[PDB]
Ligand binder design. Structure first.
Ligand SMILES: [Zn+2]
Length: 185
């Protein structure tokens, strides 16, 4: 599997079974897309501590994420991020673990796929049209998935890839998004 080289586990001590479970869920992403991620120098780092403990993310320590002034939140509290590295904290996959995604590792990986593999497909007129019609169905008022096409892309692709139940739910609730995802994957 491409995941044996794309997924970087900690060199120190880590929760073995949880890291394996996350690695297994990343297999829901098509192999061709994972291959393409690796060719762009992308690494999916599963971290045992705060993502900011990673040398390349240490610069974010004590910095306030945009939109969060006056809340006491810093990047140290954020369980996952996606830039040229995808960093996800081990044990924080489920909704409510410091984020509101269906699955943290799939969600954050799909941002890197959008940016570095698919030429920002979330920003195309076709996807914008879909986002304007359907992002409101499940996410109205969240100022996040319903506010940014990149977020709707990552979360709606997560619904598509995670399980058969979440995909069926997407097909019924957001049919234009389901059609776009099926054509893409
Ligand atoms: Zn996101």
């Amino acid at each position: 599997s491409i995941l044996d080289k794309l997924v970087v586990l900690p060199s120190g001590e880590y929760n073995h079974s949880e890291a394996a479970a996350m690695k297994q869920r990343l297999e829901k992403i098509p192999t061709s897309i994972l291959d393409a991620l690796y060719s762009k120098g992308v690494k999916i780092k599963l971290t045992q501590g705060a993502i900011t403990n990673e040398p390349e993310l240490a610069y974010l320590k004590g910095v306030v994420p945009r939109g969060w002034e006056g809340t006491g939140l810093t990047w140290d509290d954020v369980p996952g991020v996606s830039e040229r590295v995808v960093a996800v904290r081990i044990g924080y996959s489920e909704k409510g673990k410091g984020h509101n995604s269906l699955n943290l590792e799939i969600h954050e990986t799909l941002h890197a796929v959008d940016r570095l593999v698919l030429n920002e497909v979330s920003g195309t007129d076709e996807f914008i049209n879909i986002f304007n019609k359907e992002a409101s169905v499940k996410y109205k008022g969240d100022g996040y998935v319903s506010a940014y096409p990149t977020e709707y892309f990552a979360e709606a692709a997560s619904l598509y890839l995670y399980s058969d139940a979440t995909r069926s739910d997407l097909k019924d609730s957001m049919p234009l998004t389901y059609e776009f995802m099926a054509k893409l994957f």
